Specification:
part of a larger assembly, 4 chains, A mainly beta (122), B little secondary structure (38), C alpha+beta (136), D mainly alpha (119), A: 122 residues, mainly beta, Ribosomal Protein L14, D: 119 residues, mainly alpha, Alpha-Beta Plaits, two-stranded antiparallel sheet, 30% helix, binds phenylalanine, RNA-binding, rRNA-binding (chain B)
Chain lengths: 122, 38, 136, 119
RNA sequence: CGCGGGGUGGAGCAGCCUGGUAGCUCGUCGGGCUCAUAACCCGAAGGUCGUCGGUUCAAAUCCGGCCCCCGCAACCA
RNA sequence: GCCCGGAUAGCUCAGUCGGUAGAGCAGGGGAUUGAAAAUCCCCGUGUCCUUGGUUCGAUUCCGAGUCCGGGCACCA
RNA sequence: GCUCAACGGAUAAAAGGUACUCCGGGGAUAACAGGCUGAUACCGCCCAAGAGUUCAUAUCGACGGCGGUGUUUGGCACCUCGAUGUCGGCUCAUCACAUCCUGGGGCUGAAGUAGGUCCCAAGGGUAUGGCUGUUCGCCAUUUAAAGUGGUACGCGAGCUGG
RNA sequence: AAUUCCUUGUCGGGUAAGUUCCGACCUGCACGAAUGGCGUAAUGAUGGCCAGGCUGUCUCCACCCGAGACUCAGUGAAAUU
RNA sequence: AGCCAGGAUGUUGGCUUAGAAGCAGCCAUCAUUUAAAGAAAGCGUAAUAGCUCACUGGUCGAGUCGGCCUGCGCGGAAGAU
C-alpha cells in the first residue's frame, strides 16, 4: 500500500536516495500500489554526482513494501521499508545498473527482466 | 446521410421517395446525395 | 446603406401598418417582385437582398428599387429601465404592405429573372411573388 | 520571397523562410497556426502574423486573460457597472504597449518538424 | 452613459463672457556684426479659428449635431 | 462579427469628379577638402495590398479576397 | 416695494452625518428565489457568396431570414417588510438529453491503425492535487471518459462560516 | 505596499504544479517626512508563508470504555395551536 | 415508359495555359450531312480515347405532360418529480 505522497527508498543506484509518489498509474480512482506495480515518482534528495537530479519526475516499480505480499499458501513477506527502482519515462527499463537488497519473486515478468537478473536474493 | 429540412434534388440522378412519413432523396450515382427528412 | 439624406425631424411614432399597397403595378421595367406579405424591410435587408440579386445577371441587365427606408425605428440601450426619453435612432426601415412591388428588371431573359429574384427572396422577411409588366 | 514571422511586431529571424510567392499564402496562413496552439495565453492580447516586407499576408491571435470584475455587482444598474469594465479596458491598453514576450524552446519543436516521436 | 471646461500661425497661451477688430513668447525667412557658429542688433512673412448647418446686415464669438482632449461623478444592496 | 478610416518608393507618409503620382529619410551620385565627416545639390530606382470587371482612359468606380488602426460584442 | 422662479406664493429669517441607533407604518416600493417577458444569451434551421489542389454543402459558411429552451445579464413590480438567513466547500442526491465514454448505424478529402461528421440510444460510468474564499481557470500527473443543464444559480429545524 | 483599480502586472527564488509568501522592477489609478519618513536586537495568547518532528485531520474508517438514547416502576415540563 | 438502332462534318472554334482536342477557365456559338445530333447535359482523360443524355428511326397501341387557383393533411417540432 503505497499511495500518493509516501516517501520511497530507492533500490537502484543512480543517485535517487529519497523519493515521493505523485500518482498511482493504473485506472480511475486507483488507490494502492505494491508488489511491482508501476507508479509516478518525483525526486527529493539525490546525490551530487547525479545520474539524475532533484526535481525530476519519473516512473518506478514498487519493489519492497512494509505491508508485504501474500501469495497462495498464505505465507507473507514484509520488508522493513518501502523501495522502488526508477524507470525511464518513455522507454521504461531501469536507468540504474545495480540493485540493493532483496526483491520479491513476484516481480518476475518480461519488462522487469533486467531487475531480477540483478539483486542478491529472490 | 445529411438530415436537413429542405431536402430537394441535387444530381439529375437524385430520386426523392416517401418511405414511412419521411422523405428521402436517392442518387445511385453519387453516394453523398442521400438525404432523410424534408 | 440607403437612408434619407435629411429629415424634417429626427424621431417618429410607431404608427400602424394597415391597408393594401399603392404602387402595385410594374412600369419602370419588365419583371417584378410583388410582395403578398405585410411587414417591414430594414435598410440592410433591401440591400443584402439586392447583392444576391445583382450577382446573377452580373454586370448585364438593369434593376430598380421601388422602395426606400425613410422611417427611423428608435431603440433603448442594453439593460436600462423604462422611460427616460424616447430611445435614440438605430436603423431605418420602410413599411411595405401587400401588393407592393419591390424590384424590377430589364434586358434579361425571363428565366434568368425567376432565378435572379428567387435568390433575392430568401434574404427577405416578407413573402413574395414574381410578376410581369403586363400589356396594361 | 522571405516570409518573416512577427510577434507583437517583434520580427523573429529564427523563423525566416523562402518560398515561391503563390506558395506563400498557405505557408503563410499555416505557420501562424502552429504558433497559435503553442504560445501560452498572455496577460494582454497577442498578434502572431506572418508577413512579407512590412506587408502582412497572415494573422492569428492569442486571447487575453481577464478578471471577471463584474462578479460582485448585482444591483442591476448599468452605469454602476460600466465603471468597472472601463478600467478593465483602459488598463489593457497600457499592458499592451509594454508587452514583451519570452519565447523559449518553441523556436524549435514542431516549428522545426520534430513535433513527432521519436523526436 | 450622467454633468462642464476645452479645439485659435510650425509650438504653448490670450481673443470669445460683453456678434462688426486676432494678440503675446518662441521659432521660420532676409540682412547685419565675428576669423566662423551661438547669442546679439534691424526688417519682414505666417491663422479653413475642430468640423457641420443654422439666427444673422454680418459668426473665432450666437445657439443646435457630430470628432477627439481633459475633469468630476457613478452610491444602499 | 459589426461600424468608421485605411493598404502609395527600401522606411515614415501627402493626392485624386475619371485625366499622364509625389515629400522627408535611406541609397546612388555631384560640389567642398590634401579626403573625412558635416553641409548644400541632383537622380523614384513603384506594375498605388493581391485578383477579376465597366470606361476612350482606373491609384479612384464595382465584384471577390488577404490585411492595418480605432469603437462596440467575446476576452480566468 | 418680492428670481416669494419650489413661480396658489408653510418664516422677517436656515445646511450636513448616522454603520451608535430609535418608533409608526409599507410587499402601496428596492436587494435574493417565484411569476409573466425573452431585448441579451444558448441552441437549431432556410438562402449560398467564400475557403476547401478543380470541388457551394466530407469539412467549414459571411451578410440577410424564420424558430426553439428558459443557464447569464436584464425588463415589469404580480407574491413575501405583521425577520423567509445571501456565493462556495461537505454530506446525500434526483430528473432532462441538446451525449464525454461505452453501444448501433449513413456519409468521408474513409487503403490500414487513428480520426472528422450528422442520425439512434439515458442501462452503467464519469480524476486526484498546486495556487485562490472561489464555482471558473491556468498548471501538475492520471483516465474508457474526466458530458452540458434543472431541481429556491438542489441540499444551514443536516454540518461548515472561508 | 495594511496604500496599486487594471492585476493572478513583469522578472527571479521555493513547489511535480504557488491568484498567497520572499527579493526585485518603477508605468506611484491615488507613498512622503512629528494627522511623522526609512531602518531596528529584544517582546507578542497579533497578520502571511516555509521546513523537521508527531500523528485518525485525511485515503477510510474498525473495535472497545463509560454517560445519554431504548424498555420497566415514581414525579412530570415547554415553545405551539 | 421500356427494349433495338444513329448520335456525324467544318473542327483541336477563339484565345489563355506545358496541355487546353464537346468538356480547367474567358468571349463567342454560326455553317454544312441529313432520320437527326448542343462548338456540348454528365461521366471520362495527365492530355486524347472511352461511356451516356439531348435530338431521330424501330417495335410498341392508349392517354401523357408541366404549371396555375383553391380543401384538408405530412417534415420542420429538443427539458428537466
Ligand atoms: C471567470 O472568472 C468567469 N468568466 C467564469 C464564471 C463566472 C461566474 C460563473 C461561472 C463562470
Amino acid at each position: 500500500m503505497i499511495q500518493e505522497q509516501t516517501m520511497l527508498n530507492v533500490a537502484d543506484n543512480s543517485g535517487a536516495r529519497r523519493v515521493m509518489c505523485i500518482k498511482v498509474l493504473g485506472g480511475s480512482h486507483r488507490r494502492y500500489a505494491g508488489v511491482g506495480d508501476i507508479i509516478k515518482i518525483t525526486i527529493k534528495e539525490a546525490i551530487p554526482r547525479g545520474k539524475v537530479k532533484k526535481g525530476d519526475v519519473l516512473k518506478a516499480v514498487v519493489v519492497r513494501t512494509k505491508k508485504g505480499v501474500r501469495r497462495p499458501d498464505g505465507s507473507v513477506i514484509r520488508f522493513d521499508g518501502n523501495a522502488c527502482v526508477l524507470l525511464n519515462n518513455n522507454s521504461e527499463q531501469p536507468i540504474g545498473t545495480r540493485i540493493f537488497g532483496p526483491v520479491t519473486r513476484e516481480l518476475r515478468s518480461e519488462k522487469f527482466m533486467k531487475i531480477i537478473s540483478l539483486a542478491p536474493e529472490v | 446521410m445529411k438530415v436537413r429540412a429542405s431536402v430537394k434534388k441535387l444530381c439529375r440522378n437524385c430520386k426523392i421517395v416517401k418511405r414511412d412519413g419521411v422523405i428521402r432523396v436517392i442518387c445511385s450515382a453519387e453516394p453523398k446525395h442521400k438525404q432523410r427528412q424534408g | 446603406m440607403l437612408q434619407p439624406k435629411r429629415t424634417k425631424f429626427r424621431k417618429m411614432h410607431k404608427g400602424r401598418n394597415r391597408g393594401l399597397a399603392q404602387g402595385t403595378d410594374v412600369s419602370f421595367g419588365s419583371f417584378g417582385l410583388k410582395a403578398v406579405g405585410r411587414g417591414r424591410l430594414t435598410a440592410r435587408q433591401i440591400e443584402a437582398a439586392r447583392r444576391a440579386m445583382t450577382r446573377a445577371v452580373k454586370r448585364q441587365g438593369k434593376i430598380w428599387i421601388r422602395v426606400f427606408p425613410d422611417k427611423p425605428i428608435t431603440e433603448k440601450p442594453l439593460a436600462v429601465r423604462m422611460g427616460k426619453g424616447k430611445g435614440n435612432v438605430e436603423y431605418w426601415v420602410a413599411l411595405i404592405q401587400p401588393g407592393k412591388v419591390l424590384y424590377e428588371m430589364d434586358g434579361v431573359p425571363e428565366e434568368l429573372a425567376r432565378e435572379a429574384f428567387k435568390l433575392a427572396a430568401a434574404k427577405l422577411p416578407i413573402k413574395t411573388t414574381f410578376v410581369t409588366k403586363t400589356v396594361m | 520571397v522571405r516570409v518573416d514571422v512577427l510577434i507583437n511586431g517583434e520580427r523573429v529571424d529564427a523563423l525566416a523562410l523562402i518560398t515561391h510567392r503563390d506558395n506563400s499564402q498557405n505557408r503563410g496562413r499555416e505557420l501562424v497556426e502552429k504558433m497559435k496552439d503553442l504560445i501560452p495565453r498572455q496577460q494582454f492580447d497577442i498578434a502572431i502574423q506572418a508577413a512579407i516586407g512590412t506587408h502582412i499576408i497572415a494573422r492569428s491571435t492569442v486571447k487575453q486573460l481577464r478578471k471577471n470584475v463584474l462578479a460582485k455587482c448585482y444591483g442591476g444598474d448599468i452605469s454602476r457597472k460600466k465603471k468597472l469594465l472601463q478600467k478593465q479596458k483602459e488598463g489593457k491598453k497600457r499592458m499592451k504597449q509594454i508587452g514583451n514576450v519570452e519565447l523559449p524552446q518553441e523556436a524549435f519543436l514542431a516549428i522545426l518538424h520534430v513535433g513527432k516521436d521519436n523526436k
